[PDB]
Amino acid sequence: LRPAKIDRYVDKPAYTRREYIRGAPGPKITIFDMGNPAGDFEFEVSLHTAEPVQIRQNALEAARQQVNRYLQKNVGRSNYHFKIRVYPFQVLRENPMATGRKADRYGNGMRRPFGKPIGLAARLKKDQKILSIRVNRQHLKFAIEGARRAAMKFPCKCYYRIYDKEGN
Amino acid sequence: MAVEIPNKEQILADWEAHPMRRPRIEKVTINIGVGESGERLTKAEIMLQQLTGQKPIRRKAKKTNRDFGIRRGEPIAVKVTLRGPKAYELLKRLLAAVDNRLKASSFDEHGNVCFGIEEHINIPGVEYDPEIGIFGMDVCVTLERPGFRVARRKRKRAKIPTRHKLTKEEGMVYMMEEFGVEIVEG
Amino acid sequence: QKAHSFRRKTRKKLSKHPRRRGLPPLTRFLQEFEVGQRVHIVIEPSYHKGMPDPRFHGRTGTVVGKRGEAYIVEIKDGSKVKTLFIHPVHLRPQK
Amino acid sequence: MAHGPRYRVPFRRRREGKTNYRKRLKLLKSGKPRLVVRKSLNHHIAQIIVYDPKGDRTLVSAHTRELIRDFGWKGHCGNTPSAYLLGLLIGYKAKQAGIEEAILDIGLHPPVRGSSVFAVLKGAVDAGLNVPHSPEIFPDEYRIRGEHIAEYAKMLKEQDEEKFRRQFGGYLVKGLDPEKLPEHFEEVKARIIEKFE
RNA sequence: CAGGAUGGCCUCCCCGGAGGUAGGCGGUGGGGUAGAGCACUGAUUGGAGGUGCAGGGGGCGAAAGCCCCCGGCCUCCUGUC
RNA sequence: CUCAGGCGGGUCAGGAAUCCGCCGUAGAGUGCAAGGGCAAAAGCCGGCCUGACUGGACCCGUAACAGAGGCGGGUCCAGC
RNA sequence: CGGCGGCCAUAGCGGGGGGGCCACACCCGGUCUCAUUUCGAACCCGGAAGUUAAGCCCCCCAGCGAUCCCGGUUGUACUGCCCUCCGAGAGGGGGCGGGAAGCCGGGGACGCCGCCGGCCACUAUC
């Protein structure tokens, strides 16, 4: 695994379809709905994305868990509804490397500089909801703390910030 | 529940109201679906032709299976389409031979009816019978309104909406009047 | 050419809305097109047998005459003067 | 087409269920007028029609409603000798069209001999036109003269039933065919003249 | 293939000869890229309500028995693009 | 003469061929990649029939514009 | 009423009424010309006694669909053009010339038009 240095923005054309990539690895996030139903809470708090990007599968799970861990320990799962709205589709392309020598380059120039699928990534556009949580006013203050913690783990920056929708 | 009684009054009312609007029996097609041929030759065909009094028709095969219809282009089954007095006469002897009082939830959903009893062929001595003895049957009755004939030909084709259309209620009592008994349950 | 012989830059160019699909009114197949008349040539993909190279699409010529059922139209594809034989199906009147 | 924007264009004539486009496209190619012959149970129509992309124009009509009135013919109007003498009336108006070319549009119908469309065609040729056909499809003399029908009509009578002469069914109830008489046809066939007497 | 030839292209000369339309506007034609979306061909994330069914668990057992049930196989107002 | 497929009824072990009705604008099928085209058809069936014909053009692709052989098709007319 | 077209859903679905419908349907005979690898059902020869009830024609109602328009979102999304205009070399923004879909609200729209006949007619009933 490389660092996120091309997995942090939109810069390659949308090429999703598994009938031209012929399958790609599934998401590292294994759960997507958590907590209780959305009608048992009054208010809606979002983490809001302000910048178009592609965010890796690895970053979605880290971000999601780190929020969910704090939420679980303090609040318990008797309360809160937490959803991660987006789904990764965006297919990823890498030239293959094992850093050879002799007859091996890795490389290459050409002799197939072309992609390989290593994962999936989610395209987050302007004004989308990276996270959407439901809570009461009481259980506002845990969600905001989790949300700072997410915002770092985002590949860029937020500038609409921890946002009260308000849902009221 | 019950079914016969409202149906009967509607059809009787409609005839008085316009006596060349009443529903009719378009055909009775007597068929054996499962086949007597595919792997054998149907001598049930000889038995069927005497019983109808009309020529039967062979049935080409399609698909590939292992039971019947194993290759294509081979005869599989036999049917005869009866209309007019030739149907009514069939119905009276054949329905009487098998059972009566079958649910109107086990008949078609459009005023049409299929009977489903198997066994016994009328007309002795033919039902002993070499090579195929008494085989099974299915009898379908297609009921329709009188005005549809207009649609069938090449001139003034029209699919007639509910303003004269065949309603599920009437078709069942019209068939029953001719020869038939349907149970109340349905 | 290496990927041309009658098709290239087509699929979507020969594709239409489902409302413009179905074989078109009979009138246009029957339609006569006079000589001295200026015609737009528009590709109709509903009729295979007698259909322009996509490069030709949207060209405007003058009907130079007729061969058979088709008409022979002189058109200017670029600078070069060319004559194209096509059925009345693939002509529309200018005005 | 059906509901919402889906495959295939609607057409006034698909819904009407008339015409055969395939045949029609073929017919028109010659540039010759269409004699649009259409059949019904008790009417037969021929009209010399040209095509224009804007509406068709009809040069002359003739109906079986124009042969019942003013030519001393009673008959039935669905029968074959009504078609024959309909060919004759559109044979006197085709010499007033000034062109003798008259080709069959049968709409959507099969071609079999002993038909109305042949019967009229048959009357048209004798009326003096010249047309493109190859013969093998014309009725016999017994149909034209009105004699097959005469043998049937004496057999059957209406609102009666018997065993050979008044047996139930159509026989023709008219003032000058009460039992169907080829005498009647021979008078009316003598009336031939282009001044419409 | 570190090479020729033939065009496009450059120049000089000669011939025929009145329009030409790079420019801009309107009229008459062609069109699916930005964008946008659920209406198809389409890949799939997620919980409901159906319990319509192939079946891995239970019950009046006659271990999914007539009848309901639970991984679930696929409808349905919805759910990512 | 109009379809996969679905729905309910019959037949069968469900099912298929096969039957009966209702729904059904094309998802069917067209030998074979892919795409486009098409429902009184190019799809389905029955019958007949062997033009997958001879000759000589025309046009385009080939090779856009713009040179560039061979070759292919479409489109004509003449003859059968 | 009919027949032949054009635009080809602004003439789709649903429901309602009448017929100013011999002639157009249902309907009835099928011997004969003729359709069915089964049936006059289909195709065709023959007739109209009965039914207007379809169909078909005419009128009307928009709830669904499709056509077109107005306003809101929106001159927003997006864009052609230029910059020692800004950023660390990507690039962006402003001016200038243009400006879409999806959706919401509010509407026209359940045809129009051309030719020719015809019970009735000499006209438009339809």
PDB file of N, CA, C and O in Angstrom, chain D residues 2-40:
ATOM      1  N   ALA D   2     -47.369   2.988 -26.575  1.00  0.00           N
ATOM      2  CA  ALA D   2     -48.115   2.726 -25.355  1.00  0.00           C
ATOM      3  C   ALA D   2     -48.042   3.964 -24.405  1.00  0.00           C
ATOM      4  O   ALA D   2     -48.322   5.079 -24.875  1.00  0.00           O
ATOM      5  N   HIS D   3     -47.681   3.777 -23.106  1.00  0.00           N
ATOM      6  CA  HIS D   3     -47.707   4.867 -22.176  1.00  0.00           C
ATOM      7  C   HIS D   3     -46.283   5.213 -21.881  1.00  0.00           C
ATOM      8  O   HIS D   3     -45.399   4.378 -21.700  1.00  0.00           O
ATOM      9  N   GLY D   4     -46.069   6.548 -21.833  1.00  0.00           N
ATOM     10  CA  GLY D   4     -44.786   7.231 -21.538  1.00  0.00           C
ATOM     11  C   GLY D   4     -43.781   7.000 -22.729  1.00  0.00           C
ATOM     12  O   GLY D   4     -44.080   6.186 -23.606  1.00  0.00           O
ATOM     13  N   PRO D   5     -42.582   7.605 -22.728  1.00  0.00           N
ATOM     14  CA  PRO D   5     -41.794   7.678 -23.981  1.00  0.00           C
ATOM     15  C   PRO D   5     -41.022   6.398 -24.191  1.00  0.00           C
ATOM     16  O   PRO D   5     -39.914   6.231 -23.673  1.00  0.00           O
ATOM     17  N   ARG D   6     -41.552   5.464 -25.055  1.00  0.00           N
ATOM     18  CA  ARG D   6     -41.125   4.099 -25.122  1.00  0.00           C
ATOM     19  C   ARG D   6     -41.157   3.890 -26.625  1.00  0.00           C
ATOM     20  O   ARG D   6     -41.541   4.721 -27.461  1.00  0.00           O
ATOM     21  N   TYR D   7     -40.691   2.655 -26.986  1.00  0.00           N
ATOM     22  CA  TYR D   7     -40.198   2.205 -28.285  1.00  0.00           C
ATOM     23  C   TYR D   7     -41.335   2.277 -29.308  1.00  0.00           C
ATOM     24  O   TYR D   7     -42.398   1.696 -28.987  1.00  0.00           O
ATOM     25  N   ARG D   8     -41.088   2.802 -30.527  1.00  0.00           N
ATOM     26  CA  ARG D   8     -41.996   2.790 -31.639  1.00  0.00           C
ATOM     27  C   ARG D   8     -42.865   3.924 -31.595  1.00  0.00           C
ATOM     28  O   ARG D   8     -43.344   4.365 -30.549  1.00  0.00           O
ATOM     29  N   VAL D   9     -43.038   4.524 -32.837  1.00  0.00           N
ATOM     30  CA  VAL D   9     -43.874   5.690 -33.117  1.00  0.00           C
ATOM     31  C   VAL D   9     -45.300   5.215 -33.198  1.00  0.00           C
ATOM     32  O   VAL D   9     -45.456   4.031 -33.682  1.00  0.00           O
ATOM     33  N   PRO D  10     -46.386   5.974 -32.810  1.00  0.00           N
ATOM     34  CA  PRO D  10     -47.839   5.609 -33.036  1.00  0.00           C
ATOM     35  C   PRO D  10     -48.203   5.901 -34.440  1.00  0.00           C
ATOM     36  O   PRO D  10     -47.446   6.557 -35.189  1.00  0.00           O
ATOM     37  N   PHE D  11     -49.325   5.483 -34.936  1.00  0.00           N
ATOM     38  CA  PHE D  11     -49.644   5.778 -36.347  1.00  0.00           C
ATOM     39  C   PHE D  11     -51.103   5.708 -36.340  1.00  0.00           C
ATOM     40  O   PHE D  11     -51.740   4.926 -35.568  1.00  0.00           O
ATOM     41  N   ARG D  12     -51.813   6.543 -37.146  1.00  0.00           N
ATOM     42  CA  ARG D  12     -53.248   6.768 -37.137  1.00  0.00           C
ATOM     43  C   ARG D  12     -53.830   5.471 -37.675  1.00  0.00           C
ATOM     44  O   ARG D  12     -54.799   4.992 -37.117  1.00  0.00           O
ATOM     45  N   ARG D  13     -53.232   4.940 -38.759  1.00  0.00           N
ATOM     46  CA  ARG D  13     -53.566   3.725 -39.499  1.00  0.00           C
ATOM     47  C   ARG D  13     -53.186   2.480 -38.817  1.00  0.00           C
ATOM     48  O   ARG D  13     -53.867   1.489 -39.065  1.00  0.00           O
ATOM     49  N   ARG D  14     -52.206   2.380 -37.895  1.00  0.00           N
ATOM     50  CA  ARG D  14     -52.031   1.150 -37.117  1.00  0.00           C
ATOM     51  C   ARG D  14     -53.150   0.935 -36.168  1.00  0.00           C
ATOM     52  O   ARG D  14     -53.624  -0.225 -35.992  1.00  0.00           O
ATOM     53  N   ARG D  15     -53.573   2.043 -35.553  1.00  0.00           N
ATOM     54  CA  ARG D  15     -54.680   2.050 -34.637  1.00  0.00           C
ATOM     55  C   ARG D  15     -56.013   1.708 -35.412  1.00  0.00           C
ATOM     56  O   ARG D  15     -56.859   0.909 -34.966  1.00  0.00           O
ATOM     57  N   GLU D  16     -56.197   2.285 -36.611  1.00  0.00           N
ATOM     58  CA  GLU D  16     -57.328   2.064 -37.467  1.00  0.00           C
ATOM     59  C   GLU D  16     -57.446   0.653 -37.976  1.00  0.00           C
ATOM     60  O   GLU D  16     -58.569   0.154 -38.030  1.00  0.00           O
ATOM     61  N   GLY D  17     -56.203   0.006 -38.099  1.00  0.00           N
ATOM     62  CA  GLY D  17     -55.850  -1.328 -38.452  1.00  0.00           C
ATOM     63  C   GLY D  17     -56.064  -1.589 -39.903  1.00  0.00           C
ATOM     64  O   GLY D  17     -56.458  -2.665 -40.211  1.00  0.00           O
ATOM     65  N   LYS D  18     -55.877  -0.587 -40.765  1.00  0.00           N
ATOM     66  CA  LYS D  18     -56.165  -0.632 -42.167  1.00  0.00           C
ATOM     67  C   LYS D  18     -54.845  -0.394 -42.823  1.00  0.00           C
ATOM     68  O   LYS D  18     -53.963   0.162 -42.218  1.00  0.00           O
ATOM     69  N   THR D  19     -54.858  -0.722 -44.132  1.00  0.00           N
ATOM     70  CA  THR D  19     -53.695  -0.647 -45.046  1.00  0.00           C
ATOM     71  C   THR D  19     -52.646  -1.629 -44.670  1.00  0.00           C
ATOM     72  O   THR D  19     -52.520  -2.043 -43.552  1.00  0.00           O
ATOM     73  N   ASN D  20     -51.805  -1.943 -45.704  1.00  0.00           N
ATOM     74  CA  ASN D  20     -50.685  -2.837 -45.603  1.00  0.00           C
ATOM     75  C   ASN D  20     -49.685  -1.919 -46.205  1.00  0.00           C
ATOM     76  O   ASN D  20     -49.738  -1.737 -47.411  1.00  0.00           O
ATOM     77  N   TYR D  21     -48.755  -1.374 -45.343  1.00  0.00           N
ATOM     78  CA  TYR D  21     -47.676  -0.489 -45.776  1.00  0.00           C
ATOM     79  C   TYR D  21     -46.809  -1.095 -46.787  1.00  0.00           C
ATOM     80  O   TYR D  21     -46.410  -0.457 -47.751  1.00  0.00           O
ATOM     81  N   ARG D  22     -46.410  -2.391 -46.556  1.00  0.00           N
ATOM     82  CA  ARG D  22     -45.534  -3.179 -47.488  1.00  0.00           C
ATOM     83  C   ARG D  22     -45.997  -3.189 -48.891  1.00  0.00           C
ATOM     84  O   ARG D  22     -45.231  -2.846 -49.788  1.00  0.00           O
ATOM     85  N   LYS D  23     -47.303  -3.542 -49.097  1.00  0.00           N
ATOM     86  CA  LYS D  23     -47.973  -3.543 -50.327  1.00  0.00           C
ATOM     87  C   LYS D  23     -48.066  -2.144 -50.797  1.00  0.00           C
ATOM     88  O   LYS D  23     -47.879  -1.948 -51.991  1.00  0.00           O
ATOM     89  N   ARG D  24     -48.413  -1.172 -49.932  1.00  0.00           N
ATOM     90  CA  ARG D  24     -48.679   0.101 -50.393  1.00  0.00           C
ATOM     91  C   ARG D  24     -47.531   0.840 -51.049  1.00  0.00           C
ATOM     92  O   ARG D  24     -47.774   1.541 -52.039  1.00  0.00           O
ATOM     93  N   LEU D  25     -46.281   0.686 -50.488  1.00  0.00           N
ATOM     94  CA  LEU D  25     -45.079   1.260 -50.886  1.00  0.00           C
ATOM     95  C   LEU D  25     -44.737   0.760 -52.289  1.00  0.00           C
ATOM     96  O   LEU D  25     -44.361   1.539 -53.145  1.00  0.00           O
ATOM     97  N   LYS D  26     -44.926  -0.558 -52.523  1.00  0.00           N
ATOM     98  CA  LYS D  26     -44.706  -1.261 -53.742  1.00  0.00           C
ATOM     99  C   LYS D  26     -45.568  -0.732 -54.831  1.00  0.00           C
ATOM    100  O   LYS D  26     -45.118  -0.437 -55.926  1.00  0.00           O
ATOM    101  N   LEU D  27     -46.894  -0.546 -54.553  1.00  0.00           N
ATOM    102  CA  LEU D  27     -47.969  -0.132 -55.505  1.00  0.00           C
ATOM    103  C   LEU D  27     -47.735   1.146 -56.095  1.00  0.00           C
ATOM    104  O   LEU D  27     -47.960   1.396 -57.307  1.00  0.00           O
ATOM    105  N   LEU D  28     -47.329   2.121 -55.220  1.00  0.00           N
ATOM    106  CA  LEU D  28     -47.251   3.525 -55.588  1.00  0.00           C
ATOM    107  C   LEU D  28     -46.135   3.863 -56.582  1.00  0.00           C
ATOM    108  O   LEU D  28     -46.179   4.915 -57.216  1.00  0.00           O
ATOM    109  N   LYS D  29     -45.116   2.946 -56.708  1.00  0.00           N
ATOM    110  CA  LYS D  29     -43.806   3.191 -57.356  1.00  0.00           C
ATOM    111  C   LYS D  29     -43.897   3.459 -58.802  1.00  0.00           C
ATOM    112  O   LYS D  29     -43.072   4.087 -59.378  1.00  0.00           O
ATOM    113  N   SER D  30     -45.065   2.970 -59.381  1.00  0.00           N
ATOM    114  CA  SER D  30     -45.233   2.921 -60.823  1.00  0.00           C
ATOM    115  C   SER D  30     -45.559   4.347 -61.368  1.00  0.00           C
ATOM    116  O   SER D  30     -45.148   4.792 -62.424  1.00  0.00           O
ATOM    117  N   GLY D  31     -46.307   5.188 -60.486  1.00  0.00           N
ATOM    118  CA  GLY D  31     -46.734   6.598 -60.702  1.00  0.00           C
ATOM    119  C   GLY D  31     -48.147   6.658 -61.220  1.00  0.00           C
ATOM    120  O   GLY D  31     -48.747   7.705 -61.408  1.00  0.00           O
ATOM    121  N   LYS D  32     -48.691   5.389 -61.531  1.00  0.00           N
ATOM    122  CA  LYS D  32     -50.066   5.094 -62.001  1.00  0.00           C
ATOM    123  C   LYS D  32     -51.066   5.329 -60.772  1.00  0.00           C
ATOM    124  O   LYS D  32     -50.778   5.156 -59.624  1.00  0.00           O
ATOM    125  N   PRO D  33     -52.306   5.754 -61.079  1.00  0.00           N
ATOM    126  CA  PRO D  33     -53.380   5.940 -60.035  1.00  0.00           C
ATOM    127  C   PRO D  33     -53.765   4.656 -59.432  1.00  0.00           C
ATOM    128  O   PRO D  33     -53.684   3.643 -60.190  1.00  0.00           O
ATOM    129  N   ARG D  34     -54.162   4.742 -58.114  1.00  0.00           N
ATOM    130  CA  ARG D  34     -54.739   3.597 -57.405  1.00  0.00           C
ATOM    131  C   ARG D  34     -56.227   3.658 -57.451  1.00  0.00           C
ATOM    132  O   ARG D  34     -56.880   4.678 -57.145  1.00  0.00           O
ATOM    133  N   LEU D  35     -56.800   2.444 -57.845  1.00  0.00           N
ATOM    134  CA  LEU D  35     -58.249   2.225 -57.772  1.00  0.00           C
ATOM    135  C   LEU D  35     -58.358   1.511 -56.441  1.00  0.00           C
ATOM    136  O   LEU D  35     -57.932   0.358 -56.334  1.00  0.00           O
ATOM    137  N   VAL D  36     -58.820   2.178 -55.406  1.00  0.00           N
ATOM    138  CA  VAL D  36     -58.884   1.622 -54.112  1.00  0.00           C
ATOM    139  C   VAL D  36     -60.230   0.965 -53.996  1.00  0.00           C
ATOM    140  O   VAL D  36     -61.232   1.667 -53.929  1.00  0.00           O
ATOM    141  N   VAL D  37     -60.164  -0.405 -54.098  1.00  0.00           N
ATOM    142  CA  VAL D  37     -61.188  -1.325 -53.959  1.00  0.00           C
ATOM    143  C   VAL D  37     -61.195  -1.840 -52.521  1.00  0.00           C
ATOM    144  O   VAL D  37     -60.157  -2.369 -52.130  1.00  0.00           O
ATOM    145  N   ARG D  38     -62.381  -1.682 -51.870  1.00  0.00           N
ATOM    146  CA  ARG D  38     -62.403  -2.184 -50.453  1.00  0.00           C
ATOM    147  C   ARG D  38     -63.688  -2.920 -50.442  1.00  0.00           C
ATOM    148  O   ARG D  38     -64.560  -2.581 -51.215  1.00  0.00           O
ATOM    149  N   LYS D  39     -63.797  -3.869 -49.538  1.00  0.00           N
ATOM    150  CA  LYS D  39     -64.839  -4.830 -49.468  1.00  0.00           C
ATOM    151  C   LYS D  39     -65.531  -4.613 -48.147  1.00  0.00           C
ATOM    152  O   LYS D  39     -64.937  -4.198 -47.166  1.00  0.00           O
ATOM    153  N   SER D  40     -66.825  -4.981 -48.107  1.00  0.00           N
ATOM    154  CA  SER D  40     -67.676  -4.954 -46.970  1.00  0.00           C
ATOM    155  C   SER D  40     -68.686  -6.054 -47.288  1.00  0.00           C
ATOM    156  O   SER D  40     -68.692  -6.607 -48.387  1.00  0.00           O
TER     157      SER D  40
END
